[PDB]
């Protein structure tokens, strides 16, 4: 069995073919999706996923995340150096001169970290099938230089997984939908993630696969769509009450989640309520927060970010010299694409409606399962 694994930047998923039918497995906690976080508790515990995300605040410097942004790169790089500026954790230079991370004084290679998550997926598949697993396909970004793809390979070894083939994330989504068997189709995978937006135009010359044009952003995904709603709220409060919740950690962390729960609810509803009693207090007594956000306000808040995606959707085709017509198929990947407005704004720039018969956050993981599937 070659459990397929989608080693995401913000979340990872794992699947295995039940016969010919893709079956996305679920972790110990009952999630089909396991955050890509890993923290080394003060007391020496090595948490991974949900639990690790939950103690981040109380432990910023040892709760590693977004390690994919470093996997196969050297301590110098636009990415790496510019991350060193935002990552709450220590990114040091390796002797080899690679980008590494220091946790509690000990220095480890990026792969040594991801393996923690792969470790958890392997155990997750093993917990399903009953028998130990040792084989898998792991997906990478269509732009992954041989260095990363390999370093992404070292991670598996460290996890007891013999990478039987590390295929492309875009290709992954394509195999995930059913673009394998008339004789020639031209696909474009819109990938809006938790933190990254990557667009890929690939050709499945019929059954070959070929990255025709790839473009995307390093800073653009839900987490950024979130900060839009959070802020709207911080500003709104200030207008209606003269207070800066920013100043406040407790209130901010609190408002952050509400905004996040709001943002999701506003995609199956027209308006929701950010209701936070006792949000703060000042000289004039305690303060409560109660705002109304509509699909519309949110949208208005996240516009230039959804359009920024498309403007890139424009240069992706300009480099691939084609019109939305040449594009026979367009698939979406990235829980955030669940937002009506992106679904649309995209359906308009390509004319035809993008297909999503397959779960936006399980897609690429499922693609990876089918490849290693009866195939490998």
């Amino acid at each position: 069995k070659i459990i397929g694994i989608d080693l995401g930047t913000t979340n990872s998923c794992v699947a295995i073919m039940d016969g010919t039918t893709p079956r996305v497995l679920e972790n110990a906690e009952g999630d089909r999706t396991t955050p890509s976080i890993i923290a080394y508790t003060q007391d020496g515990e090595t948490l991974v996923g949900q639990p690790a995300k939950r103690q981040a605040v109380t432990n910023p410097q040892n709760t590693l995340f977004a390690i994919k942004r470093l996997i196969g790169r050297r301590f110098q790089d636009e990415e790496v150096q510019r991350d060193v500026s935002i990552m709450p954790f220590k990114i040091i230079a390796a002797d080899n001169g690679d980008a590494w991370v220091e946790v509690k004084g000990q220095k480890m290679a990026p792969p040594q970290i991801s393996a923690e998550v792969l470790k958890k997926m392997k155990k997750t598949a093993e917990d399903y099938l009953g028998e130990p697993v040792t084989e898998a396909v792991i997906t990478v970004p269509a732009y992954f230089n041989d260095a990363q793809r390999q370093a992404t390979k070292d991670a598996g070894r460290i996890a007891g997984l013999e990478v039987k083939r590390i295929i492309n994330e875009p290709t992954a989504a394509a195999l995930a939908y059913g673009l394998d068997k008339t004789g020639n189709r031209t696909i474009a995978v819109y990938d809006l993630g938790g933190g990254t937006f990557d667009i890929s135009i690939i050709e499945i010359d019929e059954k070959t696969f070929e990255v025709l044009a790839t473009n995307g952003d390093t800073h653009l995904g839900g987490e950024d769509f979130d900060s839009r709603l959070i802020n709207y709220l911080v500003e709104e409060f200030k207008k209606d009450q003269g207070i800066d919740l920013r100043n406040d950690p407790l209130a901010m962390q609190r408002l952050k989640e509400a905004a996040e729960k709001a943002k999701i609810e506003l995609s199956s509803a027209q308006q929701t309520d950010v209701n936070l009693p006792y949000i703060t207090a000042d000289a004039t007594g305690p303060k409560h927060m109660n705002i109304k956000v509509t699909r519309a306000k949110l949208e208005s808040l996240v516009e230039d970010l959804v359009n920024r995606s498309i403007e890139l959707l424009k240069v992706a085709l300009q480099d691939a010299g084609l019109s939305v017509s040449d594009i026979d198929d367009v698939i979406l990947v990235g829980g955030q694409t669940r937002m009506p407005m992106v679904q649309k704004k995209v359906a308009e720039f390509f004319g035809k409606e993008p297909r999503k018969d397959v779960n936006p956050d399980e897609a690429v993981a499922i693609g990876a399962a089918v490849q290693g599937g009866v195939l490998t």
């Binding site: 906690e29 009952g30 003060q42 948490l47 949900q50 639990p51 690790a52 939950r54 103690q55 981040a56 605040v57 109380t58 099938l129 009953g130 950690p249 407790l250 962390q253 609190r254 989640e257 209701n275 009693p277 006792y278 409560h288």
Partner: protein, 158 residues
């Protein structure tokens, strides 16, 4: 044992195929036997699972109903309160009937399995690292967490 007569090497062939046949069958019948043995292990799990978490989706959609209820006690005619305090009690006590327990106990170390440190607070009311107070109840259904509690962890004196 001479076998140059083609007709002898023919009998010797059929004899071999059949031996192969017998082989395939025996084993080809063992993997499809073991193959279901595995499906029985699962059906049991799938069952014991859907037993534990049948109501999880429902009892998860009510969390925001337990929430507006106590939220209504927070912002808070003496009776109406003892009334809505009794309701919240029957609600909780009822979901607890169906295997749900409420995570809302302070002065215990932070347990990321059912706790969500939402902020560090400089306090000596409890040992550094323990939940100092809870911002919002956390619920568990038969072992799996449906909503970690949003706690406030404590940091040393100053």
């Amino acid at each position: 044992a001479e076998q140059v007569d083609p007709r002898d090497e023919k009998v010797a062939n059929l004899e071999a195929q059949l031996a192969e046949a017998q082989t395939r069958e025996r084993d080809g019948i063992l993997r499809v036997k073991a193959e279901m043995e595995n499906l029985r292990r699962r059906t049991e799990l799938d069952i014991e699972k859907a037993h534990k978490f049948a109501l999880e989706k429902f009892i998860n959609e009510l969390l925001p109903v337990i929430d507006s209820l106590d939220r209504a006690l927070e912002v808070a005619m003496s009776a109406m309160v003892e009334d809505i305090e009794l309701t919240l009690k029957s609600m909780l006590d009822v979901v607890r009937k169906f295997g749900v327990e409420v995570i809302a106990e302070t002065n215990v170390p932070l347990d990321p399995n059912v706790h969500q440190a939402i902020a560090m607070v400089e306090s000596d009311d409890v040992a550094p690292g323990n939940v100092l107070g809870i911002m919002q109840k956390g619920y568990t259904l038969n072992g799996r967490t449906i909503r970690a509690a949003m706690v406030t962890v404590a940091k040393a004196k100053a």
